[model samples]
Target: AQKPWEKDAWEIPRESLKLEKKLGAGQFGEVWMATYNKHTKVAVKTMKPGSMSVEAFLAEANVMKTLQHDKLVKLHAVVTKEPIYIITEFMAKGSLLDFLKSDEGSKQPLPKLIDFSAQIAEGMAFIEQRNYIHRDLRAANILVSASLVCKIADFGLARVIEDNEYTAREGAKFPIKWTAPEAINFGSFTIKSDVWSFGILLMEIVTYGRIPYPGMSNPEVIRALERGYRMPRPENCPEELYNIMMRCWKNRPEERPTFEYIQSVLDDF
Candidate 1:
């Protein structure tokens, strides 16, 4: 039912938004809890000065305008002024990373953990169907709702490409530990590369937010990956899910499973 609705309709006036306390900060920005139109509560993520050209920032919000999925965070509106604000649905439970690391996560049953994996994959499936590539897919980017549902969050690096693949600039900043080898060597990104990152995210889920490649330096992780090493299963993770993670780590991008396939496999468990 969302039609002809982004451009002007998504713009919010500065006078209408009231920033509250900080939620968290990323390399490019910080998020805050804010109220819109003096009534609705929302999270307002602020872009730092010069982090992006104003036009680039605006266009990025446009990329998010029409995507609506139960597991994808909702983009309510954008206040595209200096120190731009991206308004999204408020999630009190915070990021899935901290949520999973806390005592709250330790108490969850195996079924609940598996379901969270499927929920994140479900959102990625929807984004994949619409031909958008989530350049960053990790536990930190997935927000947890008060209802305990997992939603794919963040889009500063996401893009909808006319070509099936996107080649990024050499030496562009990417979290190598979570990146695919192809992406590391050539900055080549496709939905398949995202599948590889999902493998790392899944590892985070199983390990209760343990950092991937623990005790290994960034370059060392790259060296290890080139030697054909992949992270082994967490002792307690399902064998089936471990198999799925292995499928995602295939060196050839085309050989890897799509988000839809991953979601289906997890749901079947």
Candidate 2:
């Protein structure tokens, strides 16, 4: 049942949303290129049955509803029916992860890489200002448009920042490679945690989409980080950019630069 406080305007009739084709599958759902009003192209993310609880579903819907930024994916509506559907703007080029790994992305110029980084930083800065934390921030969650613009997406793992930290439930599955030491050990999530993931995203782009901590098993990766081992700078990565990546990976969360600071630094470059 829909909550009384939830806005009906955010709800779309199940019949009105038409799925044209399957785009891809995510951790929680499959995404489709959908049409609204018979002509407007949009992306519809459908949740798998038993994949998420009602509370978590609503939390994600609320976050998407309240957030609006050019660098952020725009949520048009949601269908809370039998199969939940989240409608948002379409990204023709797909995820930044796929784009970076594709033949075209491999040939992208240096300026294009910088542009994508700056866009992601700007989007994250907006999320920071809104008092929220994107616990999962990685290349796979960032979408790329046909025009080469980037926008942050996937708020399923997002939550409001309470006292600058949100303690996730124990045993919650997180992307081990992209997570920070504190997050991996203590389930601590914060803007700084996101900063750590952003640093890894930088590595992903620079390496043309190499997996973080390659060849290391999850247990090994965790043990390595516990030993203060950080990934080497990606090949051909600029010293200045790699320096920022290192700063973002500092052991202390407070030592990591804020997304605002990141945006400013990238803008200056």
Candidate 3:
């Protein structure tokens, strides 16, 4: 039986895509502000030449094409020419982390922060329902639309779970601070691990883009977690919210609340 979200390649012609300015760089490629058919503005993610094989690139693109949610960045088309381009909807406001740290974003009220965090949790819950794991879920991967809507993007580290869980290959790099303790120690990634990252994300939002585990090196963070150290609540953070974040960082992955549960909690606030 065919999956409900499955779709064809939707390959786009290279000639119709025009690069304008660089938007940002990711682990696999650089994103640019580009135009389609000379007038339609879009964000294009181009892989570094020779950085990835066609099969590997297409695999990720295919998975992304299958994912569609209002709170998730839309993948428009894929151009597999000399410089591969993965066309996606252009987000005017850029990354959620950068937006929050900006002068304008800094003035937002507490309610706005809660809304943003809830939206992200909502998006991740959708992904969870589809059985996909966003191996890297952080503030930076969350994009803010011009209208101030938050959407999850950057599938470079995403994976579709085929069974019980996915064990990452040895020596693969990860965002240590945002990573779950299990992932950092055993190279295992599951939906629950993503929940762990979401807990740190709450810290990131409430702290106004503060780096997770500031002043502590990567090694120190690992050592601290080994000692059961967790980040304290951001100043002025409501106890209710802090308790939710604490649930996400539980030592046992099974103890973490599902994204569905987290969303339900946030919706009530």
Candidate 4:
């Protein structure tokens, strides 16, 4: 509902708004907790000029404004004045990453995560339905409510692309470990790459929040994958889970199951 290049968008009085805690920092900026109008809780992300190009930021904002799906976080408004603001639903539970660090580590896996993956797939499927590609779909980007309902947040790196362009091209190199082999070594990041990340996320959930590589760095992960390594299949993981993961982490991106196919498997599970 905003005009293109709307200026002074965040000047409205935030007199009652209180900055609570720093949620996290990213390439662009820090996210914070802010309570406004006394009754409303929100997450505010502000961009410092040096962090990201205005054009790229606005492009992300525009895509975010237009996306409407239950699995995706809702953008209540944007602030364009000094200190650009992105207003979104606050997740008191923070991100999936935070849950991993919590004391409850391994205390009977949270059903919330399993349900969250379904929600995330639904959101990504919706975006894919509209031809938008989430270039970065990692555990860190998923936000969880106090009740643990999860939604995919942060669409800054998304792109609208043709189905065929799913394959890696000029600007689409994905994270090697989370990426389908074909996508990483050869640049083929179709819907399959998304599935690969999903599979890793699934493994993370099944393991009750263990990161894929605790002691290893990115280079070590890549080396292992190059030598045909994978996160060891999780113990007590359902057989179907293992099969689906294999399909996703296949060396060839095209060999991986389609998101629709994975959805059908999950639907049956």
Candidate 5:
């Protein structure tokens, strides 16, 4: 049940507001561009009860509530009683993925992409300092607000993988090509694994939304990667950015650069 201030929960939208456009969809829910109080703008993510287990809901909610940073999209409010609504800051310009996919292409260097990546590194470093590893970082989850600030979103698969219990299992799978070798094969996910995913996101930024290994099947890509094949760096990518991407994709997780190191290097560049 909602409090009096949140009475909109009980009243129909016709009475209090309206559900507007369908903004986006993901495995767990649909995010809508909702208008409330006839003026305020909000992105409302509504989830069904079984979309994710209650435990999963609590996990993400807890993480969002505890984390607050300029590089993170804030969770303004949560209504879990029914038709679960997670209210978050509206990204008027939408996802980084959309920006990269636009006609802007790679005509000229996109300094904002690097700055955005650095901001993500800073946010990830903050989370890592608190012992949380975001196992599923991706371009689609990084939102760019109208102000152009890049904020890391989506923490459902994030975990505190500091112990053996959280170690990767052999043959364990992930989004395949984006995962670090250890995470893909040995099921060993760690903060380093997140670094690998961030590298993939970096590539997405550099490639302007091109799919990784476009012509290869998942199995073929897996075998090739296992045999030392790697995604080629994009032509427009700067040498420094390419070097950073290479470090993140190193086969050995231990060889990956820490977010702190990445932030420093990127900032200096």
Candidate 6:
């Protein structure tokens, strides 16, 4: 059988590179703090420890290049031997969630937070232009660089828009509070559903990584959303920025602004 994944602009790293330390775990597997070269740092993420169709993984690797932007943590390579190693740009400052909770980010000015949001919107705008829907666009999925630039990280749940939409099957591990009503009810997802999730991410950003709909369980959050309840304005969130988040949370997908529009809005303020 032909190896369908090779020669697709694949870049391999030297084995002599250090393993470094364990940075954190993701839905895929443990992320390692490693270096492809001394000055240029990168991280390696291994595939999960369970078995799946090898071709499925190959399918994922081949499409990696179609989505690339400076605002996104670029997936540079996918080493397909054994358990699989995915190479992506390693951010030195670490997770946006952790950074937001840190003393620096906790006191981080409002404009900087908005700038972080704008950067993500720019990235999401490009992803939208490419007809891809990032199924999971949460605050935790955002990462910060050494210079404090925010970039959208991870692609485990990203899907190209086919048939103008995609839908998950029942009982999948979708985040309830972060999901749109239509998506939660029908498992259907579109770029608009991603916009809805961005609204939740914005909530987390304004609150400096606070949980969405705090004190409510997943089922309760779902119920509240079904009843047309939206979270209150986060403490000290700018009215316009909160307005932007609310528009993204519109119940009807058609009412939500596209990423292009969102990109323009955040860039202006």
Best-fitting candidate, scored by lDDT: 2
Tens digits of lDDT, candidate 3, 11-41: 7778888899998886778989998998799
lDDT of 1 by residue, 1-269 (tens): 44433446778788888897898886777989988888898998788887757666666667677668899898888876576777889988899999988889778778888899999999999989998898999998999988889998878689886778999998797998899999989999999999999999998998889999999999999888888889988888889989999999998999999898999999999
Could you give candidate 6's per-residue lDDT for residues 194-232 as a string of tens digits?
A: 999898998899899999999999888888877888999
Candidate 5 Cα misplacement greater than 4 A, ranges:
1-18, 36-39, 104-108, 163-165, 168-172
Report, for all candidates in order, the number of backbone clashes: 0, 0, 0, 2, 3, 0
TM-score of 3: 0.91
Cα TM-score of candidate 6: 0.91
Score candidate 4 by TM-score against the native.
Answer: 0.84
Q: What is the TM-score of each candidate against the true structure?
A: 0.90, 0.92, 0.91, 0.84, 0.85, 0.91
* lDDT for each residue of candidate 4 in 41-123, tens digit (9 for 90 to 100): 98988787787777677567678777778788877766665577777889887877667567653454545445666677777
How high is the lDDT of residue 264 in model 4?
Answer: 66
**Which one wins on TM-score?**
2
lDDT of each: 0.87, 0.88, 0.87, 0.71, 0.77, 0.83
Overlapping backbone residue pairs in candidate 6 total: 0
Output the lDDT of residue 193, model 1.
Answer: 94
Better of 1 and 6 by lDDT: 1
Model 2: how far residue 107 lies from native, Å: 1.6
Indicate whether candidate 2 or candidate 6 has the larger TM-score.
2
Sort the predicted structures by lDDT, highest score first: 2, 3, 1, 6, 5, 4
